[PDB]
Design an enzyme around this catalytic site. Structure first.
Site, PDB file in Angstrom:
ATOM      1  N   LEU A 288       0.865  -1.167   0.000  1.00  0.00           N
ATOM      2  CA  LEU A 288       0.000   0.000   0.000  1.00  0.00           C
ATOM      3  C   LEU A 288       0.906   1.223   0.000  1.00  0.00           C
ATOM      4  CD1 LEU A 288      -2.740  -1.016   2.600  1.00  0.00           C
ATOM      5  CD2 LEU A 288      -2.610  -1.498   0.147  1.00  0.00           C
TER       6      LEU A 288
ATOM      7  N   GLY B  94      -0.455   4.659  -0.237  1.00  0.00           N
ATOM      8  CA  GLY B  94      -1.380   5.766  -0.182  1.00  0.00           C
ATOM      9  C   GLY B  94      -1.138   6.813   0.878  1.00  0.00           C
ATOM     10  N   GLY B  95      -0.137   6.646   1.741  1.00  0.00           N
ATOM     11  CA  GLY B  95       0.095   7.597   2.814  1.00  0.00           C
ATOM     12  C   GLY B  95       0.940   8.797   2.429  1.00  0.00           C
TER      13      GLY B  95
ATOM     14  N   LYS C 139       4.509   9.666   2.319  1.00  0.00           N
ATOM     15  CA  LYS C 139       5.140   9.118   3.515  1.00  0.00           C
ATOM     16  C   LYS C 139       6.257   8.153   3.144  1.00  0.00           C
ATOM     17  CE  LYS C 139       2.487   8.121   6.940  1.00  0.00           C
ATOM     18  NZ  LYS C 139       1.452   7.389   7.727  1.00  0.00           N
TER      19      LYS C 139
ATOM     20  N   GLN D 290      -4.927   3.563  -7.523  1.00  0.00           N
ATOM     21  CA  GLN D 290      -6.157   2.954  -7.047  1.00  0.00           C
ATOM     22  C   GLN D 290      -7.367   3.754  -7.531  1.00  0.00           C
ATOM     23  OE1 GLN D 290      -5.997   4.380  -2.446  1.00  0.00           O
ATOM     24  NE2 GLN D 290      -7.796   3.176  -3.036  1.00  0.00           N
TER      25      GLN D 290
ATOM     26  N   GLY E 104     -10.763   2.732   0.874  1.00  0.00           N
ATOM     27  CA  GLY E 104     -10.002   1.865   1.749  1.00  0.00           C
ATOM     28  C   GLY E 104      -9.193   0.799   1.034  1.00  0.00           C
ATOM     29  N   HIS E 105      -8.390   0.106   1.846  1.00  0.00           N
ATOM     30  CA  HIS E 105      -7.472  -0.921   1.361  1.00  0.00           C
ATOM     31  C   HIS E 105      -8.155  -2.010   0.548  1.00  0.00           C
ATOM     32  CE1 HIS E 105      -5.090   0.158   5.272  1.00  0.00           C
ATOM     33  NE2 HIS E 105      -5.196   1.176   4.437  1.00  0.00           N
TER      34      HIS E 105
ATOM     35  N   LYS F 277       4.277   5.593  13.073  1.00  0.00           N
ATOM     36  CA  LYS F 277       3.117   6.461  13.023  1.00  0.00           C
ATOM     37  C   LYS F 277       3.351   7.812  13.666  1.00  0.00           C
ATOM     38  CE  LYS F 277       0.210   3.284  11.440  1.00  0.00           C
ATOM     39  NZ  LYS F 277      -0.316   3.326  10.050  1.00  0.00           N
TER      40      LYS F 277
END
Lengths: 471, 102, 102, 471
Positions: free
Chosen positions: D87, D89-90, D101, D164, D193-194, D360
């Site tokens: 993933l 997406g951050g 990120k 996505q 969402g995922h 985080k």
């Protein structure tokens, strides 16, 4: 078994003191006096071995009479048989003052005792009658009292004094009296509760001295309640109802949730306090409902009734246990209201709050010295211009001792039109200070606030520090 | 202040005032004439005043009376709210005092 | 607060409340209705309360119970964070107390 | 009735946007993409109109396999069919950092993406196999991503990228999509969402691209969990059990009481969170008993299984509703774990905590940059000399932004032999600071504490203010 052994040792110890005594008259007095404690001590041990909210039924409407319902004033002729007796056992040590509390000044240099006599004087001068005024003194004050009372010589005032019972302190561990000899130090003794009045009046011969002048009605009130002024209105209700015991009552205010309350107990009117209310129901007992009256301690009684209960020895009282530590001991005390149950036609009256204004702490002395009260021939009556009840005053922990009070408040502030006042920390009030509405003063920890003279405060909060030093 | 009277447009000092005019020296906070109205909504009585010094944040309530010499020294950054009706005679004032409506 | 209940749109005070409505007077910091939600996220229980005064920065946690008279006076410029669950009876509160998440 | 009206208006609005489109390929993509939301939106209204702790039964012993019980490592030959998908997406906005990120540095200038590739590189060089590494990007990062990915050119690394689904934001009041045109601003869209991974892999053609190289097993993990290293041991259990879905689990620590937990739900293993646990039982659900496992998000899956659930349209997800305020809108999201219910032989494995170390917040970045971790060919393994678990570090609210972090802590303190550390207020740590045992630093409100260089602290509390200025 240990109870009997302790009772035997106690008996021998009590008798040993009675054996070592110089004079027969003292022996007689001491024997009767000390023999009462033996019975009390036995009941005390027995009552602990034996150890009811269900029985705490609310007072029925038939048990309380309203002051507004009482009839016309009693005729002057009936005042010759009335008699007033005051408790005079309080020391100024409670307020950090030397001598008896009765001697401390309240206003314009007058002592609390002075006002009482002055009230008696007002009665004799208005009708030419001489009401006897008896003082129930204590061993802690008699010596200072015997000196100061001389200031009342001459004036038409029959003053008689006597000392209450002098019981010895009982050792907590041995359950035996701490003193051995007859002339043992005062630290070995303590004055018992108010209920000792009945026998003390007899044992001292005061009952004879009172009977010698034909007094038939007795009135008791604490020297600390300046509101307990003689009101001929109440005596008529007594003469009509011929009750053996009449207690004045007042409606509980927000501050009176605590303290004793009358209970009907199946017609046999009784009283109880936190000292005996079950912890599981204290919260219920504190409710405003069910318990709407509290004991003012102003009581009216029949002298022959007092004699009869003593002659009949029917006088049995609720023992109160207090502890102290001699540089440990137990003390047994009783309340002035508890006797209500053993009297025929015993019922209470509810009176307006103008009859209850105690002086227990610093917050009271300020209210009485202010411009809100005026003294007329020795009676304090609030200014008819004041609306609502008395303003609430609650000074902080710094004003505990009565000596310091004069340092921070050299002149009393004007309190007319004041609603609520709170003072915390070091606050010094200059002269001619006027407070209106609500005033909240919160001094910074360790700093002082010097309110400037002439200050006029209206509905506001004050916080900070301000120093005023002479140029 | 009350020390002067206006007659047909002429200022004459009160014949009752002894000595010369009292000396008044306000601190650097009162420079602008607009702010002056905020801190002194009503002029204090200055008869019988001898000398007055004000430094820092000082707010004078109504009907303030000053007699003799009065020295007010506010704490740096804090304010002193002189309560209304205050009567001051020959004294030094220092500290901080807040007056907020209940 | 819990002192009022709405029935079909009519407010009637709980018959258990003795005397009149308690007096509440918040300080000058709570003027705007938006900020009100920040300092008092949950209304304190006010049954059996007699008088309440709040001055300065005061934050009331959840489930705060006030009984009798409560006077809160925050230090000028500092904040008082009343801890959750606090039960106050007839007392004066003054000072500064910070509660930060670990 | 309102549900049908809203669904009708939504359909017309969604279709109108799909009608206004410049290219057919986009129309194909947009039509399928937008048609999925219509079904989701319908279920959302229906689920809201329709609105069980009794059914929250604890996981049975048959539902969890222990990592120590799994057999020997899987043979190299079987690795050709594995595939890893990340993933991506951050955004760095979560930590006040610019860009994605995945680009922010962690240690020695390396980015989080760098370590993943580096881990892949070590695997290919040790056995000469090429595991495909797929990145599930987002529209918010692709532009920065498409730039930075070029740095990985040359090196034997098959990098494939795709975006996505881009769903539009729905207006809270009108319940209609906020964007009107095709070229509407990004503020009108949000990444779902995922769970969108399954369809996204297919719709982008990545599934073909993956199938083109014969990969049979898919592994997913979040880019933020540096512990998600490829371990051939787990693939053998997969090859043996041939389960359609295997999720890695860890025992809940004191900090993991919150967050998702596996539920047996009558064999049909499921998952739930505070988003659906009843408020009357959240306290019960937080108990250490009954719910001893939590979702790590490390998941192993069969690529053909993913294809089949998409081809069969068996893919049904738990809708998650999120709200935002565009300078109000609703967002629908899904979790990576919820899909577990639709898979045969789906069961979980419990792995040692060395596999879960998220980044985080500030408290994580300090632990990873310290001397407590060493990087070997791109894999982090804690020093075998460290006893007990990882020390707890909890910095105050002043260290939120990652930029400021470099100002107050120019050099990481030595944290070996540290047990617990708390920092509140303005604290500046000089170079070569050593902390032993427990250290509590509480700065005075508004003041700063400059810990002098070389300081050695052992079991102590530090409070105050200390300034260090150059002479």
């Amino acid at each position: 078994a240990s109870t009997s052994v302790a009772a035997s040792q106690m008996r021998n110890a009590l008798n040993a003191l009675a054996e070592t005594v110089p004079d027969p008259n003292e022996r007689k007095r001491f024997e009767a006096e000390m023999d009462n404690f033996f019975a009390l001590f036995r009941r005390f041990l027995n009552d602990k071995a034996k150890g009811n909210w269900d029985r705490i039924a609310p007072p029925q409407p038939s048990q309380v009479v309203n002051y507004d319902d009482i009839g016309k004033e009693s005729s002057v002729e009936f005042l010759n048989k009335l008699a007033v007796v005051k408790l005079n056992g309080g020391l100024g040590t409670s307020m950090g003052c030397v001598g008896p509390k009765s001697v401390i000044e309240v206003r314009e240099g007058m002592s609390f005792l002075d006002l009482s006599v002055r009230q008696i004087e007002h009665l004799n001068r208005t009708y030419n009658v001489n009401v006897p005024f008896v003082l129930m003194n204590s061993f802690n004050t008699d010596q200072d009292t015997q000196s100061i009372i001389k200031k009342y010589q001459g004036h038409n005032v029959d003053i008689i004094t006597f000392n209450q019972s002098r019981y010895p302190r009982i050792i907590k561990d041995s359950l035996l009296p701490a003193p051995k000899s007859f002339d043992a130090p005062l630290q070995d003794w303590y004055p018992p509760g108010h209920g000792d009045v009945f026998e003390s009046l007899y044992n001292s011969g005061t009952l004879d001295k009172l009977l010698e002048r034909g007094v038939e009605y007795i009135f008791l009130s604490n020297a600390d309640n300046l509101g307990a002024v003689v009101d001929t209105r109440i005596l008529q209700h007594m003469i009509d109802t011929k009750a053996e015991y009449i207690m004045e009552l007042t409606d509980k205010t927000k501050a009176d949730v605590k303290g004793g309350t009358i209970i009907d107990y199946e017609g046999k009117v009784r009283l109880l306090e936190i000292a005996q209310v079950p912890k599981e129901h204290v919260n219920e007992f504190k409710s405003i409902k069910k318990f709407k009256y509290f004991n003012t301690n102003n009581i009216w009684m029949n002298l022959r009734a007092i004699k009869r209960v003593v002659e009949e020895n029917e006088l049995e009282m609720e023992i109160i246990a207090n502890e102290k530590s001699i540089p440990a001991i137990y003390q047994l005390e009783t309340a002035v209201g508890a006797a209500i149950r053993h009297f025929k036609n015993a019922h209470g009256v509810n009176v307006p709050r103008r009859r209850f204004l105690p002086v227990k702490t610093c917050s009271d002395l300020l209210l009485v010295k202010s411009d809100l009260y005026r003294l007329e021939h020795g009676q304090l009556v609030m200014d008819p211009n004041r609306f609502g009840g008395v303003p609430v005053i609650k000074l902080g922990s710094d004003f505990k001792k009565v000596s310091d009070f004069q340092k921070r408040i050299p002149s009393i502030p004007r309190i007319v039109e004041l609603d609520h006042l709170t003072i915390t920390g070091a606050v010094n009030l200059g002269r001619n200070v006027t407070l209106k509405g609500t005033v909240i003063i919160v001094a910074t920890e360790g700093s002082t606030i010097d309110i400037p003279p002439g200050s006029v405060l209206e509905n506001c909060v004050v916080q900070g520090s301000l120093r005023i030093l002479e140029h």
